[PDB]
Structures are given as C-alpha cells and as structure tokens.
Amino acid sequence: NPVERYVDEVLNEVLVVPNINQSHPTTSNAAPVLDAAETGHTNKIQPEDTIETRYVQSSQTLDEMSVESFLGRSGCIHESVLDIVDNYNDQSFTKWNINLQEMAQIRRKFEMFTYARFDSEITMVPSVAAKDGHIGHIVMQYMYVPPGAPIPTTRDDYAWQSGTNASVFWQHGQPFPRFSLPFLSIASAYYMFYDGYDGDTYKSRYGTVVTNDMGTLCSRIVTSEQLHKVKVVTRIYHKAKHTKAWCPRPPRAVQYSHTHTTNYKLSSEVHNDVAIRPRTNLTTV
Amino acid sequence: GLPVYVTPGSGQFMTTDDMQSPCALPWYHPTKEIFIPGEVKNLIEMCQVDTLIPINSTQSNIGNVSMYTVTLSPQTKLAEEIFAIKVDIASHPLATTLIGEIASYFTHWTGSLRFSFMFCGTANTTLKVLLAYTPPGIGKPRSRKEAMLGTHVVWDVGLQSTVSLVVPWISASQYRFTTPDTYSSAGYITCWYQTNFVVPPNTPNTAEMLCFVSGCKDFCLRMARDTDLHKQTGPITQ
Amino acid sequence: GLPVYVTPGSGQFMTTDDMQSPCALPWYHPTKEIFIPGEVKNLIEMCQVDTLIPINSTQS
C-alpha cells in the first residue's frame, strides 16, 4: 500500500535490520565459527552462533545508507572566479570544462563505485565582492555549451545569444539559481574508472578523459562596465538524483593530484601519505 | 491571486534539501539502461564483506604487505600475548578497512562485528589460540586468564584455515560515536597462545596469520558526515 | 515547487484588507463570554434612537 509505504518514508523505516534471537549452549560437530577464507566468501556467522544471546527487537533502519542517500547530498564541484582588475572586456567572462574530479570530497564518494548513473541537480551560489565599494546591478549569464557548440571568445560573442543552448540568467538579490540535468552519457552509465585508451599508439590518452566529456560552462557578467570593480565568485554545487551504482571499490587512500587519473605522489616517508597511524607494536592499543 | 505567507527558510539553499527544479534539457531522452553485473543499492552490502586489517602497521611495516600479517612462532613462555587492538570501528588500525572507511562517513554506529583469522603456516603446523573480546569499563586484560573471563573463542588450527570471533553489541546506549569518544569506547580484542605453535622437524619455525573484519546482520550506521580519513591540501588540476 | 506568478499588490499593506495572520499567542484560551445586556450589532440601531437637536445654538 503506497500510503503505508509513505509513512515508512516519513519515519525513515523502509529498510529494517533483523532482530537478534535468543540462543542456547551447544555441543555439536557442526562448527559455524570455522571456515575457509580461501573461497573468497565471508563467513556468515552471527552473534547467536558464538554466544548465548537474548532476544532483542531491532529498530534500526538502513535507509540513510542507501546509495541515493550517500550520493544525494549537494557538494561543491567548482569555484568560478570573475575578478575585474584592469580590463572589463577580458575579465568579465570565463569558461570551465565540466567534471566531478576537482573537489576531493564528492570525487571520493563517487569513486567508491566503478560505474554510476544519475540525474544531476546543479545549484549555484554567486557572491559579489564590492572591491571598490558599490556593486551596482549585477546580472549573470551561465551558458551550458555541449561539446561541439561554439565557445565564446569575447564578452559580446554571438554565441551568448543562446539561440539553442540552455542559459540561466541570475539577478543579484534573487534566490540561488538551480536546474536539473538528465543523465548525459552516450553510454548506459558514467565511467568512474576506465582502463582504456582512445587509440592504440604510444600517444593515446588513457583513462576517463577519453569517455567523460560533458562540455563547457561559460559564464559572463551581463551588466556592462561599471565604475566600481567587483569580484564575482560563483560556487557550483552538484547533487546526484535517481542514482544507480555498480561494482564497489576500495576508497581513495592517498591524495588526488590530477583530474581523470589515479596518479599520486609518494614522499620518502610513506606513512605520512596515508591515514594509517603507525602503531608502537602489536599489543599497544 | 491566492494569498500566500512566505515562511522562514524561503530562498535559502540547504545542501540536503529535496526539491524539484526545471530541467535544462527538455525533450532529451537518456541512453537506454543495460544490465551491468554488480549493482549496489545500499552501503550495508559493502560492510558485510571481509577486508584485511592492517594490524601490524608499525612505522617500519607501513608501505609493505607485511603490515597485514601477524607472525606466530614456538614460544618458550606459556600464555603469551599475540596482539591487542581496540574494537572501535573507526579507530586505528580498523580505520582503513572498508567497514572503517564507510563508518567514517557516518557519525553513529551499532551492531556486532565479525573478526576472522586465517592461518597461513604449513599443513603440518598446529596451533591453538584464544581470541577474546573485553567489554568496556575495564582496562585491556594483562593476561590470558584476565582476557578469557570475557567473550572468547578458542581456535584450533586444522583442515579449515579460518575462524571467526563475533564482538557482540554490548553497550549502554543503542548507538556509539564512530569518532573516538570516551563514553562510547567499545572495548578490546586480544589474542593469546592457548597451547603453542608446534611443527615437525624441517618445517619453517614461523608462520603468518591474516586478519579480516566485516559487520554482522545488525550492523548499522547513522548520520552522514564528511570523512576525516582523506583530505585535499591543494587544487586538483588537469 | 508549484510555479507561481506574484501579482501587483503583493507586499502592500492596505488598511482595509481582510487577510489572515499568525497568532502571537498560540494555545491561549480567551476568557469565557458572559451575557451583558445592551449588545449592539449594527450602527443603524443607534440611528433609530431619538436624540436632542441643539436647535437654539446661537453663540450666547
């Protein structure tokens, strides 16, 4: 019943964990505690098998541990800066090749899976710093340029007409802009990892750069040159919605160094490169 | 028009909100979904899989596979201690295991833990070991006698190489903090020689043991948070 | 969210408007009404009663 299911949603009790049943002393030739990890399987022994347990009714739920929940939180993926220093025409617009590889926080979460499929919610937080005192009337234009569409080379480029591309215009003082993007891949899922090349020569590119081209985000201050200079920083936040993920993997253990690659750097003292805190010895807790 | 009352909270952006928003690409039809083996729907699926504990992570072993093995050998003194670690899911050396890493993305944890051990000596090497869990409210046991007064398993090495010790959920509160907290410290797990490591002549006099950890049917995490087991100290560039 | 169109007049305060507003004292139960003689419901009731005309209102 969709209404009972509804109540479970409100209470967050869709996925309940099992109870612990009462167990008793045993003397048997069946030894559940013994197994063989060589098989590649995890021994499914439970507490009732090793100790005498009491009956306990569980009230914990796994709803919050769902993939939708784990990846369904909006995190920063880019900080766009438009700093008017000495040339308005050159400094009032910019572009960014879109990716989820530049901020470690969300990158690491998505990379705990090999493939992922989801729709995207993008929320933008623009902040106008009054470097000279006044901000005037700031109007921004954020244009999504799919691969192949002409990229504007000036603040008055004809490409800004946005005759076909999607553009979002924001006016200072109005609420933060937000829009959704359908799953954009030409494949059935996004590659979080890709052990492949775009060719078969020594100069072929390796990794997700080959498969993950999502276009460019071009920004521009629509307002013409003003007396007072401003520094507009637009932070882009991304949230995955309607998510599916496949083939889990070990979490990134070292710092990221570059986009689209698993490359890392190691110091002479490797213990400083990982989160593992050195133990004094085996018996010192 | 319909009279409306704009409520506090309007216009704010909360990273955890759940609102609808217009689609920038109307009419667009996404690529057909194909079947891909290995779909994961809940992180609990990853917490139920055994991963190795870097139990021998002394400064000299870190950066070596040896940080994952415990060495056993013939003893001259009886009931010697082999190893001792805290049971706290996100404490070291449990922190970097898959379950420790996932636990670090949450604030609270509950449930029982399953610790497994696989003996890797020769087929002719014998050994009996006592694995114990000491509930909180007391220090780590200083002797085998002290340790066995708690929850324990006497492991007899034989045809089946692996044994499992379950650390039952024995807590005052229903949940404990994943971050080290005095009030919620879960206790200790120690390993002692029950008998001794015995081998026939012409057989290696030391052997390794691997240690695993995973969550039981009642393991559960709560209150999502950012992990402290990974950082970004600079820009990630192209 | 539901798409809305903010109409002219929004945000204004017209002294003769008839809108609802949140109560500053929630849960408060007003004093019991008792019967009091002489209730007036419409000003017409007062217009139907004779009053004296100051017809000889010369300055003196």
Binding site: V3, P182, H242 | Q20, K41 | -
Partner: peptide, 29 residues
C-alpha cells in the same frame, strides 16, 4: 503530475515539471 492515494490519509506525490530529471530524490528498493 499527481499520484493520489487514499487510506482518510491521502497522499499527493506531485511532479511539478515535465521531465523525469526534475523530480526529487527517489524512493527506495
């Protein structure tokens, strides 16, 4: 777009836009 249930406890699962990408977080299972 409205999924109206009844139990009375009526549920209204409204979808305000015409594209699936626009809806909020997915149900579970």
């Amino acid at each position: 777009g409205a999924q109206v249930s009844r139990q009375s406890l009526n549920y209204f699962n409204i979808n305000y836009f015409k594209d699936a990408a626009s809806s909020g977080a997915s149900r579970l299972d």
